[model samples]
Target: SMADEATRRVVSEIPVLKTNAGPRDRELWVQRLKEEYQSLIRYVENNKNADNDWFRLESNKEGTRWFGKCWYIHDLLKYEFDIEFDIPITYPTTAPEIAVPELDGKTAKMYRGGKICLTDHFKPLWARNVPKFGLAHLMALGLGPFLAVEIPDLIQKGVIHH
Candidate 1:
């Protein structure tokens, strides 16, 4: 009875399960979403002390207005943030862009004139289709070490609160 109730609840809550080509495909997508969401939550929680004065993982549905702002704050704070895709992200795909509001309180970097730097090594990794080129890989190779190296000096100089 409990198992039946749980199945019904899941199917009802996720209409995609009803229309997906096969149970396997729907299950895969659901599993991917769950894993990605968990990883994202963990990243935000762990990095809360990394001087994220204006970091936001979610974006507005309208025009890419706040996208630039998000990158701006991230670069200004010398922090890295990622937005994961729910569906299959193929290679050579454009990784989510980032915006940097200011560089040295002057010109902007990483994000300028609504264009994010999407040519870096990390961008390719994010877009790669390798089995391991997912959230866990991004966290370990992309954001984790980058923040660790970038934050120490800022922390020493009191630029970052923590």
Candidate 2:
């Protein structure tokens, strides 16, 4: 929603999560975990279907930690970065904090350890969406734009090559 139409469409096409459970709540967390996986799976499949595949992610056994690789193409070169996030204890209420640690010092658009700075527009949108938004939404609206804008800029700035 903070970026272009493509992000809007991607986020719109993806399904919203239904459960309100966080990791500390054992019983429903199981129910919530599967829903999370299902949502992620569907989003990945959607990407592949459109041939816009850009990322791969999986979680720890508890589904609390997630890590992945995401790539962007600049001047016919593929630029990739390691991405990770932890589901906050207050999750379903608090959004996941996404990171691209390899780009830590390259840009001002990120925080410590490369946590991509969600713009002022993003926080309230996530606030309004709450439990309905999950990891997939984060990737589509969060990481996708970060890659699109930053990768090209970094490459041109000579901070990243190939």
Candidate 3:
């Protein structure tokens, strides 16, 4: 439970945010924001309890811009990277784009601006679950897989020095 399985458990533990309001909605956005914070706090605590925490994040006052660091331990050497995401104007319906700037050119699995490229397999799933998925879901399903796959390769290829 210390790796992928742990991540899955953490993801499952995070409660789904029910409000569908985007950042543009004034009143409803407050409700959505509250739910977002609740879910995020729950996820953080769950990860801490499991000793499987890999990331930390904070958001702006409006909860529109999220920035933080996420690390993956590769061969006992921790590879940490800056991660950020902006809640889309159409959030809840659109997933926030997660970026890892340090891994920008090291792998093809990412787009410019360090945004991690989600697979077609995952995109469809995200779309299918729109409004139910939140920031925690993005980290669990999107960034988690990218780090698990690319970080080790980056380490082995010397793209990221230990």
Candidate 4:
């Protein structure tokens, strides 16, 4: 029933995306899907390289319920690490948990049982007149500081650079 409801909602919202379509209609739908997918991909890629970058990790694995991304910590210790985020039912509105693999032969302080603390900067600011940030902005705000502080070590180790 839920699947059917989801399908109905999708189809109703985007009638052009319906499966039963004429050849021309199918082609148009395919084109639209491709365009939207490519646009999203490009947006993420471009933002990844911007001077004010957000995500330090790249998507190494992704699924409907979960996703994994990684950033290397190359501070002569040579810790190639990854972090994963489980999809929340209220994603974009709710921050996901994050974790890195073992660090210096021990678990990272920021992660406990695969759940990382949401930094104050990353947390939603809900003062009366404050605007809620979009997903991209939230992600950037959350991860940007961590990367900035550690980027020098990463660059020195030839892990990443401008």
**Per-model lDDT:** 0.38, 0.85, 0.83, 0.40
Per-candidate TM-score against the hidden true structure: 0.38, 0.92, 0.91, 0.44
* lDDT, residue 49, candidate 4: 69
For model 4, name the residue pairs that clash: none
Strongest candidate by lDDT: 2
How well is each residue in 1-162 modelled by candidate 3, as lDDT tens digits? 264465456467788888989989998998998888888778778888977789999999988899999979876778778999888888888888898888777788888988899987667767877777688788878888888988888888889886
Candidate 1 vs candidate 4, lDDT winner: 4
Best by TM-score: 2
Candidate 1 worst ten-residue window by lDDT: 14-23
Model 3 ranges off by over 4 Å? 1-10
Model 2 whole-model lDDT (C-alpha atoms): 0.85
Off by over 4 Å in 4: 1-40, 47-64, 72-79, 103-109, 126-135, 150-162
For model 1, how does the per-residue alpha-carbon lDDT over 49-75 read when each residue is reduced to its tens digit?
555432344423321222322222333
Candidate 4 residues 1-162, lDDT tens each? 674464334223221211222113446435533433343344467655653222343332222133335343333433334555553444334555654443222323355554545655346341211222222333444443455455454466654443
How would you encode candidate 2's per-residue C-alpha lDDT over 1-162 as one tens digit per residue?
345565566687787888899989897998888888888888999999987788999889999999989978777777788999998899988988899999887899998999999977677777878888888888887788778888888888999877
Q: Which 10 residues in a row give candidate 3 its minimum summed lDDT? A: 1-10
Query: Between prediction 3 and prediction 4, which has the larger TM-score?
Result: 3
Ranking by TM-score: 2, 3, 4, 1
User: What local lDDT score does residue 83 receive in model 1, on the 0 to 100 scale?
Assistant: 33
Look at candidate 1 and give me any clashing residue pairs. 71-99, 71-100, 72-99, 72-100, 72-101
Candidate 4 has an lDDT of 0.40
